[PDB]
Design a protein around this ligand. Sequence first.
Ligand SMILES: */C=C/C(=O)Nc1cc(-c2cn(C)c3ccccc23)ncn1
Length: 301
Amino acid sequence: GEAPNQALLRILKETEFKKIKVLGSTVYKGLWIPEGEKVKIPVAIKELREATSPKANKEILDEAYVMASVDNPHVCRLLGICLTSTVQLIMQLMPFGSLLDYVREHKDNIGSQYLLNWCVQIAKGMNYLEDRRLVHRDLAARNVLVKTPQHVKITDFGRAKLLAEYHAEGGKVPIKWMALESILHRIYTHQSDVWSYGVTVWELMTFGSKPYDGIPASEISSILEKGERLPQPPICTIDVYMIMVKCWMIDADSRPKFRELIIEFSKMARDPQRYLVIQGDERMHLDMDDVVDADEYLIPQ
Ligand SMILES: */C=C/C(=O)Nc1cc(-c2cn(C)c3ccccc23)ncn1
């Protein structure tokens, strides 16, 4: 009926890695030395809060399921899990944090070529997920992480589902990123992901503004019914903005396909200064001995 998911789940001993410092509240920056190999891998180690909670353990393991089942240069893969007191997820370290934080903090040093390349990379990653019958259901600039300024990946599969639609039943949801059919009828498809892609592109082109800032989430489905959308970002030619606006069409099948968003952003990345107009764009740049990035650490498939 469907393909068997032969993804490897790798179980790692607590001794194979050092937690080096904290990044969040918990996610640690760490180093992973796979046992009996002369490599050290920069890692992020995500460790369950309570660990008392049986609800919590179902959460993290579902994320682990999805992360183990993806392999694409624009999607965060799982390196393994460690079954301790608190279950910890081991993933590739993304040193430059969320792309949302990166645009806010570097808004004066980011050129049209970077912004359009990111739009292509995120599109490629979402196209891969669509290929693998996977709906992310939480695409947002907070959930795109920066390996290098030249290389971003989609992350936080906390809400991702495999398939068709997906009728969910309430919860803590990210309203301002969600398709109308998602807010009204809790329906989610690849095309509801495309809507959030639209909002994601808007976030990047406004250097990390909050969409519908100071509109309460109780208002949002009404505004969107009325036909209002996010405004044209200042740097955006009608060309770019028209693409975001297509992602926000009420008819989900009239929205663009990720594969097409790859194509359209790629044309525009061949001539970035024609499509995004940015003040000063022209002039902008952006033992360790055994260390190897996770992206160069392969095991048999
Ligand atoms: C490529 C997998 C990956 O997620 N790497 C990664 C993740 C983070 C990260 C994720 N979350 C939810 C965080 C919260 C606070 C600080 C860092 C977080 N960081 C680095 N690499």
